[PDB]
């Protein structure tokens, strides 16, 4: 089915670095240059107050829509990733259900400005106080802390490409039918990422990457807070949340 489902040579690993970086560039959603340029465009005190005055349900709906748009780009990234389309549909869905939000959380560090602790949201940069109407302050503060910690690594776009391919191709996800195929694809993607770090003298980031439990905790907290919101506003979730978001986080 795929060359990367077996042992790959050094030349094949070099090809894989290029393929993963290309897949990421083509599906990155927003250009890094565009996010950096917009750092000076910050919501005013008046604009922050307006977001704070929004209802809890209208703010949840807006955030669920923005997350779903980000997730759609991650699904396209997965489809372009060498080997992913050669996995069975059961496994593609297991990997995306478990990993799409983790990839969005990693990609989000590009949109996070560590200098003033702001994130790009709806056209300008705002701090965690922008999201106060959601009623999930611990989860927002945890996402901002995570972005802050990844921002301190000064990732290049190629490092995010290779790190997110690995976040997605995780042979430990429960439910995989072709586990040995995913294990080999994961091994080759790990070699591609580590080869790139070695070549660019960036192997020092390996001990600094967050543990898997960190991404798991963030995803667990998101599903828990969604369950709380859904109990409060069940018809908002049924009637106005995106179908893809419900498929990933509220069992359809």
């Amino acid at each position: 089915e795929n060359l990367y489902f077996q042992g790959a040579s050094l030349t094949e690993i070099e090809h894989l670095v290029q393929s993963v970086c290309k897949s990421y560039r083509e599906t990155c959603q927003l250009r890094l240059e565009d996010l950096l340029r917009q750092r000076s465009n910050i919501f005013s005190r008046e604009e922050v107050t307006g977001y704070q005055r929004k209802s809890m349900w209208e703010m949840w709906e807006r955030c669920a829509h923005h997350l779903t748009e980000a997730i759609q780009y991650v699904v396209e990234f997965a489809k372009r990733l060498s080997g992913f389309m050669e996995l069975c549909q059961n496994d593609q869905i297991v990997l995306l259900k478990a990993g799409a939000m983790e990839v969005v959380l990693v990609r989000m560090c590009r949109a996070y400005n560590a200098d003033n602790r702001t994130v790009f949201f709806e056209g300008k940069y705002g701090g965690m106080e922008l999201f106060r109407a959601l009623g999930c302050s611990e989860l927002i503060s945890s996402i901002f802390d995570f972005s802050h910690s990844l921002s301190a690594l000064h990732f290049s776009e190629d490092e995010i490409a290779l790190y997110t391919a690995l976040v997605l191709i995780n042979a430990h996800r429960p439910g995989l039918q072709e586990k040995r195929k995913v294990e080999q694809l994961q091994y080759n993607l790990e070699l591609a990422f580590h080869h790139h770090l070695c070549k660019t003298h960036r192997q020092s980031i390996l001990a600094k990457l967050p543990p898997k439990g960190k991404l798991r905790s963030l995803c667990s907290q998101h599903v828990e807070r969604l369950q709380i919101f859904q109990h409060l506003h069940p018809i908002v979730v049924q009637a106005a949340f995106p179908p893809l978001y419900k498929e990933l986080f509220s069992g359809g």
Binding site: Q72, V75, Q89, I93, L96, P243, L244, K246, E247, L248
Partner: peptide, 12 residues
């Protein structure tokens, strides 16, 4: 019972 992933995966 929303199933969108199957659609996105099969759409070429």
């Amino acid at each position: 019972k929303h199933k969108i992933l199957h659609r996105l995966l099969q759409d070429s």
